[PDB]
């Protein structure tokens, strides 16, 4: 009921029913600790993900402005760009994607397979660039050129992580709260923390619906020092827009992404292997694999606030498995 | 009625979506709906999860500790079985063949085949699955001699028990379709036959006016019809029903063979992707959608009314089939 101001934002229906919240009995056995999973990897458009929730709000907003083109940015293998491109195609909007190679790879599958293949299936107009040094500004320049061609573009920022976009994860917290109700009394929630909309949206929602639960973001691209201010700003802007206050502290663990965004690491791949072999759940080498590696090491190192049930938010990413194989 | 008397595991939960496809409908000049069984929640999804609910229940009731099955290197059925084995703590042994003689690295190692590896699937390569039921049985015996307790899942999980999952799917469809329809037509890919046959039984009894058309993906009408019919009669027998409906099959859409992409198939993949953000695949749903399209093209359906396409999954093979062969 404190999140009722959410009702006032127009949104499209991309998801429908709440995504499953499942107990992981085999993984729990192995880690010695009750673990659950929020399956946002099973959202029903083009192989799923956390970005569909944000797109419900952002695309609603675009249509409301009479836009006919969605414009966004990410790595060649971004899930966000793939989701945005899938939603564009489904609604008959044009889509332009500004892409970069953040790891300097020349591997054929990174360059052409996985998410990148799907963009071509979606008739995505592709704009390569050297490095997204200033993505907000670089998106704007692109939007101007696109407009000059007569299109009516709507810029979706990196990962859809504006306060409006992040409303989808406030919404997700309501699902989670309901799903947990009488069930598992949760101590902790683990989510990947990248462009920050998921983390920030969950922070606001969980502070007001489950204020005793500890929320941990495992960084996938940045140190705590670089990432915290970004999650905080979004948290405050989301709160502002919902006429709430957000006093919770943001928690981040930055030990699990080295050597960099989009580079696999051993602990990441081990987590992917663990979850596949124990639960038939597919994680990914860029986001959820590193996040699950974080969760695991936090049990190892007694990093969590107590010994109680943990909820892992599965944010998607699996198509990247095929792009990352055999190596980058 | 009797469907309930069969033990089943919960792999799916809520009914899968049934969606109108307004952009595709607009382009074809015809109302089109899709049953999204590509969205089942385990390891990238598919039609086989429905069958596995019944078959794996049965395995557990016999105290098995190992699932054994067979398919192509890029089979979805094997990948779905392997995921289910992994999640239940069961070992899995997959008997694989290369049905198209390819040496392309992604066909051999990526897509579904990569996933088997992540699931710790024990892999048995063989030159050709000439007699899959027999070959599976021999395998089962050697596995048993190592002290395991194996349970054979036949190709495609298409035994009468396995096909109960698609009788079940017809219920979901029937209930979902009251808001909408009236359907004239349902289109599904017809391979090892469990999907086709189970839908045949369910739909005869729940929507007897709807025409069900299977687009073959591996065989001529002459070869496939007896297989679907046998399964239809066995399913009906086990539910103490009769099944008098004719089986309809279109075999024009799979040349030059099982597991080989064709132009119409890839054009169907491209069409659904660019119009609806839906992902089909080169082996199964792409060819099936090509058939639905050509049926409209050639006025092959019984009338001009709404069509339901059953999406049976397959998308991970897109990544195995790229760039070619
Ligand atoms: C599977 C997966 N998990 C997690 C995230 C991170 O959530 P976020 O913090 O982004 O809200 C992304 C999106 N990645 C977007 C953000 O980073 N670069 C991209 O194009 C993703 O695809
Ligand atoms: C996406 C997809 N569609 C359709 C089918 C065919 O369904 P059926 O008619 O067999 O129930 C399969 C079956 N996988 C079987 C079919 O052929 N060999 C296999 O491994 C499949 O993976």
PDB file of N, CA and C in Angstrom, chain B residues 106-173:
ATOM      1  N   UNK B 106      29.888 -25.164 -34.741  1.00  0.00           N
ATOM      2  CA  UNK B 106      28.751 -24.801 -33.913  1.00  0.00           C
ATOM      3  C   UNK B 106      27.689 -25.889 -33.863  1.00  0.00           C
ATOM      4  N   UNK B 107      27.459 -26.606 -34.969  1.00  0.00           N
ATOM      5  CA  UNK B 107      26.550 -27.737 -34.880  1.00  0.00           C
ATOM      6  C   UNK B 107      27.089 -28.799 -33.934  1.00  0.00           C
ATOM      7  N   UNK B 108      28.398 -28.990 -33.955  1.00  0.00           N
ATOM      8  CA  UNK B 108      28.990 -30.038 -33.189  1.00  0.00           C
ATOM      9  C   UNK B 108      29.109 -29.704 -31.711  1.00  0.00           C
ATOM     10  N   UNK B 109      29.221 -28.419 -31.370  1.00  0.00           N
ATOM     11  CA  UNK B 109      29.672 -28.063 -30.020  1.00  0.00           C
ATOM     12  C   UNK B 109      28.880 -26.983 -29.260  1.00  0.00           C
ATOM     13  N   UNK B 110      28.063 -26.244 -29.989  1.00  0.00           N
ATOM     14  CA  UNK B 110      27.347 -25.118 -29.456  1.00  0.00           C
ATOM     15  C   UNK B 110      25.864 -25.493 -29.324  1.00  0.00           C
ATOM     16  N   UNK B 111      25.032 -24.521 -28.942  1.00  0.00           N
ATOM     17  CA  UNK B 111      23.591 -24.705 -28.839  1.00  0.00           C
ATOM     18  C   UNK B 111      23.238 -25.772 -27.820  1.00  0.00           C
ATOM     19  N   UNK B 112      22.266 -26.611 -28.161  1.00  0.00           N
ATOM     20  CA  UNK B 112      21.871 -27.720 -27.297  1.00  0.00           C
ATOM     21  C   UNK B 112      23.026 -28.627 -26.791  1.00  0.00           C
ATOM     22  N   UNK B 113      23.978 -28.888 -27.683  1.00  0.00           N
ATOM     23  CA  UNK B 113      25.117 -29.722 -27.361  1.00  0.00           C
ATOM     24  C   UNK B 113      25.991 -29.123 -26.255  1.00  0.00           C
ATOM     25  N   UNK B 114      26.116 -27.800 -26.237  1.00  0.00           N
ATOM     26  CA  UNK B 114      26.866 -27.149 -25.155  1.00  0.00           C
ATOM     27  C   UNK B 114      26.122 -27.316 -23.835  1.00  0.00           C
ATOM     28  N   UNK B 115      24.800 -27.221 -23.901  1.00  0.00           N
ATOM     29  CA  UNK B 115      24.038 -27.300 -22.691  1.00  0.00           C
ATOM     30  C   UNK B 115      24.185 -28.690 -22.050  1.00  0.00           C
ATOM     31  N   UNK B 116      24.263 -29.741 -22.871  1.00  0.00           N
ATOM     32  CA  UNK B 116      24.422 -31.109 -22.335  1.00  0.00           C
ATOM     33  C   UNK B 116      25.645 -31.209 -21.470  1.00  0.00           C
ATOM     34  N   UNK B 117      26.666 -30.526 -21.880  1.00  0.00           N
ATOM     35  CA  UNK B 117      27.903 -30.463 -21.176  1.00  0.00           C
ATOM     36  C   UNK B 117      27.826 -29.786 -19.843  1.00  0.00           C
ATOM     37  N   UNK B 118      27.135 -28.677 -19.801  1.00  0.00           N
ATOM     38  CA  UNK B 118      26.826 -27.978 -18.560  1.00  0.00           C
ATOM     39  C   UNK B 118      25.954 -28.845 -17.620  1.00  0.00           C
ATOM     40  N   UNK B 119      25.117 -29.726 -18.185  1.00  0.00           N
ATOM     41  CA  UNK B 119      24.307 -30.647 -17.374  1.00  0.00           C
ATOM     42  C   UNK B 119      25.045 -31.952 -16.986  1.00  0.00           C
ATOM     43  N   UNK B 120      26.320 -32.075 -17.321  1.00  0.00           N
ATOM     44  CA  UNK B 120      27.064 -33.314 -17.000  1.00  0.00           C
ATOM     45  C   UNK B 120      26.435 -34.532 -17.630  1.00  0.00           C
ATOM     46  N   UNK B 121      25.891 -34.355 -18.820  1.00  0.00           N
ATOM     47  CA  UNK B 121      25.320 -35.478 -19.531  1.00  0.00           C
ATOM     48  C   UNK B 121      26.456 -36.409 -19.997  1.00  0.00           C
ATOM     49  N   UNK B 122      26.289 -37.702 -19.744  1.00  0.00           N
ATOM     50  CA  UNK B 122      27.185 -38.686 -20.282  1.00  0.00           C
ATOM     51  C   UNK B 122      26.760 -38.837 -21.731  1.00  0.00           C
ATOM     52  N   UNK B 123      27.719 -38.736 -22.634  1.00  0.00           N
ATOM     53  CA  UNK B 123      27.445 -38.758 -24.070  1.00  0.00           C
ATOM     54  C   UNK B 123      27.934 -40.044 -24.756  1.00  0.00           C
ATOM     55  N   UNK B 124      27.035 -40.659 -25.510  1.00  0.00           N
ATOM     56  CA  UNK B 124      27.315 -41.849 -26.304  1.00  0.00           C
ATOM     57  C   UNK B 124      27.139 -41.539 -27.805  1.00  0.00           C
ATOM     58  N   UNK B 125      28.224 -41.351 -28.534  1.00  0.00           N
ATOM     59  CA  UNK B 125      28.090 -41.120 -29.972  1.00  0.00           C
ATOM     60  C   UNK B 125      27.828 -42.424 -30.736  1.00  0.00           C
ATOM     61  N   UNK B 126      26.947 -42.389 -31.724  1.00  0.00           N
ATOM     62  CA  UNK B 126      26.856 -43.517 -32.625  1.00  0.00           C
ATOM     63  C   UNK B 126      26.616 -43.073 -34.072  1.00  0.00           C
ATOM     64  N   UNK B 127      26.976 -43.955 -35.012  1.00  0.00           N
ATOM     65  CA  UNK B 127      27.077 -43.609 -36.434  1.00  0.00           C
ATOM     66  C   UNK B 127      25.710 -43.308 -37.034  1.00  0.00           C
ATOM     67  N   UNK B 128      24.710 -44.078 -36.662  1.00  0.00           N
ATOM     68  CA  UNK B 128      23.364 -43.780 -37.088  1.00  0.00           C
ATOM     69  C   UNK B 128      22.365 -44.494 -36.194  1.00  0.00           C
ATOM     70  N   UNK B 129      21.346 -43.759 -35.771  1.00  0.00           N
ATOM     71  CA  UNK B 129      20.281 -44.324 -34.985  1.00  0.00           C
ATOM     72  C   UNK B 129      19.335 -45.020 -35.952  1.00  0.00           C
ATOM     73  N   UNK B 130      19.767 -46.179 -36.430  1.00  0.00           N
ATOM     74  CA  UNK B 130      18.939 -47.019 -37.307  1.00  0.00           C
ATOM     75  C   UNK B 130      17.753 -47.669 -36.582  1.00  0.00           C
ATOM     76  N   UNK B 131      17.964 -48.098 -35.339  1.00  0.00           N
ATOM     77  CA  UNK B 131      16.882 -48.685 -34.527  1.00  0.00           C
ATOM     78  C   UNK B 131      16.897 -48.150 -33.101  1.00  0.00           C
ATOM     79  N   UNK B 132      16.317 -46.957 -32.901  1.00  0.00           N
ATOM     80  CA  UNK B 132      16.526 -46.248 -31.640  1.00  0.00           C
ATOM     81  C   UNK B 132      15.974 -46.962 -30.415  1.00  0.00           C
ATOM     82  N   UNK B 133      14.838 -47.638 -30.539  1.00  0.00           N
ATOM     83  CA  UNK B 133      14.279 -48.360 -29.387  1.00  0.00           C
ATOM     84  C   UNK B 133      15.182 -49.501 -28.913  1.00  0.00           C
ATOM     85  N   UNK B 134      15.675 -50.273 -29.879  1.00  0.00           N
ATOM     86  CA  UNK B 134      16.629 -51.345 -29.638  1.00  0.00           C
ATOM     87  C   UNK B 134      17.986 -50.829 -29.143  1.00  0.00           C
ATOM     88  N   UNK B 135      18.482 -49.773 -29.781  1.00  0.00           N
ATOM     89  CA  UNK B 135      19.777 -49.215 -29.416  1.00  0.00           C
ATOM     90  C   UNK B 135      19.749 -48.680 -27.972  1.00  0.00           C
ATOM     91  N   UNK B 136      18.658 -48.003 -27.611  1.00  0.00           N
ATOM     92  CA  UNK B 136      18.446 -47.527 -26.252  1.00  0.00           C
ATOM     93  C   UNK B 136      18.458 -48.647 -25.214  1.00  0.00           C
ATOM     94  N   UNK B 137      17.852 -49.786 -25.575  1.00  0.00           N
ATOM     95  CA  UNK B 137      17.756 -50.971 -24.720  1.00  0.00           C
ATOM     96  C   UNK B 137      19.094 -51.618 -24.428  1.00  0.00           C
ATOM     97  N   UNK B 138      19.918 -51.766 -25.465  1.00  0.00           N
ATOM     98  CA  UNK B 138      21.286 -52.266 -25.320  1.00  0.00           C
ATOM     99  C   UNK B 138      22.059 -51.358 -24.394  1.00  0.00           C
ATOM    100  N   UNK B 139      21.929 -50.042 -24.616  1.00  0.00           N
ATOM    101  CA  UNK B 139      22.604 -49.057 -23.790  1.00  0.00           C
ATOM    102  C   UNK B 139      22.168 -49.267 -22.327  1.00  0.00           C
ATOM    103  N   UNK B 140      20.860 -49.315 -22.120  1.00  0.00           N
ATOM    104  CA  UNK B 140      20.284 -49.503 -20.791  1.00  0.00           C
ATOM    105  C   UNK B 140      20.887 -50.679 -20.003  1.00  0.00           C
ATOM    106  N   UNK B 141      21.117 -51.790 -20.698  1.00  0.00           N
ATOM    107  CA  UNK B 141      21.699 -52.991 -20.107  1.00  0.00           C
ATOM    108  C   UNK B 141      23.157 -52.778 -19.656  1.00  0.00           C
ATOM    109  N   UNK B 142      23.998 -52.196 -20.506  1.00  0.00           N
ATOM    110  CA  UNK B 142      25.387 -51.895 -20.105  1.00  0.00           C
ATOM    111  C   UNK B 142      25.442 -50.906 -18.945  1.00  0.00           C
ATOM    112  N   UNK B 143      24.510 -49.946 -18.935  1.00  0.00           N
ATOM    113  CA  UNK B 143      24.440 -48.959 -17.863  1.00  0.00           C
ATOM    114  C   UNK B 143      24.063 -49.677 -16.562  1.00  0.00           C
ATOM    115  N   UNK B 144      23.141 -50.622 -16.688  1.00  0.00           N
ATOM    116  CA  UNK B 144      22.653 -51.377 -15.541  1.00  0.00           C
ATOM    117  C   UNK B 144      23.743 -52.272 -14.956  1.00  0.00           C
ATOM    118  N   UNK B 145      24.580 -52.822 -15.839  1.00  0.00           N
ATOM    119  CA  UNK B 145      25.745 -53.612 -15.443  1.00  0.00           C
ATOM    120  C   UNK B 145      26.776 -52.801 -14.674  1.00  0.00           C
ATOM    121  N   UNK B 146      26.812 -51.483 -14.846  1.00  0.00           N
ATOM    122  CA  UNK B 146      27.689 -50.679 -13.997  1.00  0.00           C
ATOM    123  C   UNK B 146      27.034 -50.380 -12.646  1.00  0.00           C
ATOM    124  N   UNK B 147      25.831 -50.931 -12.433  1.00  0.00           N
ATOM    125  CA  UNK B 147      25.119 -50.744 -11.164  1.00  0.00           C
ATOM    126  C   UNK B 147      24.091 -49.627 -11.092  1.00  0.00           C
ATOM    127  N   UNK B 148      23.827 -48.955 -12.212  1.00  0.00           N
ATOM    128  CA  UNK B 148      22.798 -47.925 -12.240  1.00  0.00           C
ATOM    129  C   UNK B 148      21.406 -48.558 -12.394  1.00  0.00           C
ATOM    130  N   UNK B 149      20.373 -47.748 -12.198  1.00  0.00           N
ATOM    131  CA  UNK B 149      19.011 -48.185 -12.403  1.00  0.00           C
ATOM    132  C   UNK B 149      18.407 -47.245 -13.428  1.00  0.00           C
ATOM    133  N   UNK B 150      18.559 -47.592 -14.711  1.00  0.00           N
ATOM    134  CA  UNK B 150      18.182 -46.708 -15.811  1.00  0.00           C
ATOM    135  C   UNK B 150      16.697 -46.774 -16.172  1.00  0.00           C
ATOM    136  N   UNK B 151      16.198 -45.674 -16.721  1.00  0.00           N
ATOM    137  CA  UNK B 151      14.862 -45.631 -17.253  1.00  0.00           C
ATOM    138  C   UNK B 151      14.947 -45.082 -18.662  1.00  0.00           C
ATOM    139  N   UNK B 152      14.435 -45.841 -19.615  1.00  0.00           N
ATOM    140  CA  UNK B 152      14.544 -45.475 -21.014  1.00  0.00           C
ATOM    141  C   UNK B 152      13.439 -44.467 -21.346  1.00  0.00           C
ATOM    142  N   UNK B 153      13.821 -43.297 -21.847  1.00  0.00           N
ATOM    143  CA  UNK B 153      12.843 -42.413 -22.450  1.00  0.00           C
ATOM    144  C   UNK B 153      13.003 -42.568 -23.953  1.00  0.00           C
ATOM    145  N   UNK B 154      11.929 -42.980 -24.659  1.00  0.00           N
ATOM    146  CA  UNK B 154      12.050 -43.144 -26.112  1.00  0.00           C
ATOM    147  C   UNK B 154      12.233 -41.803 -26.842  1.00  0.00           C
ATOM    148  N   UNK B 155      12.758 -41.866 -28.065  1.00  0.00           N
ATOM    149  CA  UNK B 155      12.927 -40.694 -28.920  1.00  0.00           C
ATOM    150  C   UNK B 155      11.733 -39.745 -28.835  1.00  0.00           C
ATOM    151  N   UNK B 156      12.021 -38.502 -28.518  1.00  0.00           N
ATOM    152  CA  UNK B 156      11.019 -37.459 -28.438  1.00  0.00           C
ATOM    153  C   UNK B 156      10.092 -37.601 -27.265  1.00  0.00           C
ATOM    154  N   UNK B 157      10.374 -38.551 -26.366  1.00  0.00           N
ATOM    155  CA  UNK B 157       9.453 -38.905 -25.274  1.00  0.00           C
ATOM    156  C   UNK B 157       8.072 -39.320 -25.766  1.00  0.00           C
ATOM    157  N   UNK B 158       7.972 -39.741 -27.035  1.00  0.00           N
ATOM    158  CA  UNK B 158       6.673 -40.002 -27.679  1.00  0.00           C
ATOM    159  C   UNK B 158       6.144 -41.442 -27.499  1.00  0.00           C
ATOM    160  N   UNK B 159       5.929 -41.816 -26.237  1.00  0.00           N
ATOM    161  CA  UNK B 159       5.117 -42.974 -25.881  1.00  0.00           C
ATOM    162  C   UNK B 159       3.765 -42.434 -25.440  1.00  0.00           C
ATOM    163  N   UNK B 160       2.780 -43.333 -25.310  1.00  0.00           N
ATOM    164  CA  UNK B 160       1.430 -42.919 -24.932  1.00  0.00           C
ATOM    165  C   UNK B 160       1.428 -42.182 -23.559  1.00  0.00           C
ATOM    166  N   UNK B 161       2.221 -42.660 -22.607  1.00  0.00           N
ATOM    167  CA  UNK B 161       2.357 -41.949 -21.342  1.00  0.00           C
ATOM    168  C   UNK B 161       2.885 -40.552 -21.625  1.00  0.00           C
ATOM    169  N   UNK B 162       4.039 -40.489 -22.306  1.00  0.00           N
ATOM    170  CA  UNK B 162       4.665 -39.206 -22.668  1.00  0.00           C
ATOM    171  C   UNK B 162       3.675 -38.243 -23.312  1.00  0.00           C
ATOM    172  N   UNK B 163       2.878 -38.749 -24.249  1.00  0.00           N
ATOM    173  CA  UNK B 163       1.936 -37.886 -24.956  1.00  0.00           C
ATOM    174  C   UNK B 163       0.776 -37.342 -24.070  1.00  0.00           C
ATOM    175  N   UNK B 164       0.679 -37.816 -22.829  1.00  0.00           N
ATOM    176  CA  UNK B 164      -0.388 -37.336 -21.969  1.00  0.00           C
ATOM    177  C   UNK B 164      -0.201 -35.831 -21.716  1.00  0.00           C
ATOM    178  N   UNK B 165       1.058 -35.400 -21.665  1.00  0.00           N
ATOM    179  CA  UNK B 165       1.396 -34.002 -21.501  1.00  0.00           C
ATOM    180  C   UNK B 165       0.755 -33.098 -22.540  1.00  0.00           C
ATOM    181  N   UNK B 166       0.511 -33.630 -23.751  1.00  0.00           N
ATOM    182  CA  UNK B 166      -0.149 -32.846 -24.800  1.00  0.00           C
ATOM    183  C   UNK B 166      -1.661 -32.971 -24.836  1.00  0.00           C
ATOM    184  N   UNK B 167      -2.165 -34.053 -24.264  1.00  0.00           N
ATOM    185  CA  UNK B 167      -3.587 -34.116 -23.992  1.00  0.00           C
ATOM    186  C   UNK B 167      -3.846 -32.969 -23.008  1.00  0.00           C
ATOM    187  N   UNK B 168      -2.972 -32.848 -22.006  1.00  0.00           N
ATOM    188  CA  UNK B 168      -3.079 -31.873 -20.919  1.00  0.00           C
ATOM    189  C   UNK B 168      -3.037 -30.480 -21.535  1.00  0.00           C
ATOM    190  N   UNK B 169      -2.170 -30.315 -22.530  1.00  0.00           N
ATOM    191  CA  UNK B 169      -2.016 -29.032 -23.212  1.00  0.00           C
ATOM    192  C   UNK B 169      -3.303 -28.574 -23.940  1.00  0.00           C
ATOM    193  N   UNK B 170      -4.021 -29.535 -24.541  1.00  0.00           N
ATOM    194  CA  UNK B 170      -5.331 -29.302 -25.152  1.00  0.00           C
ATOM    195  C   UNK B 170      -6.350 -28.721 -24.161  1.00  0.00           C
ATOM    196  N   UNK B 171      -6.307 -29.125 -22.911  1.00  0.00           N
ATOM    197  CA  UNK B 171      -7.157 -28.567 -21.882  1.00  0.00           C
ATOM    198  C   UNK B 171      -6.909 -27.117 -21.664  1.00  0.00           C
ATOM    199  N   UNK B 172      -5.655 -26.824 -21.484  1.00  0.00           N
ATOM    200  CA  UNK B 172      -5.192 -25.437 -21.388  1.00  0.00           C
ATOM    201  C   UNK B 172      -5.669 -24.643 -22.614  1.00  0.00           C
ATOM    202  N   UNK B 173      -5.453 -25.195 -23.786  1.00  0.00           N
ATOM    203  CA  UNK B 173      -5.859 -24.484 -24.970  1.00  0.00           C
ATOM    204  C   UNK B 173      -7.370 -24.212 -24.951  1.00  0.00           C
TER     205      UNK B 173
END
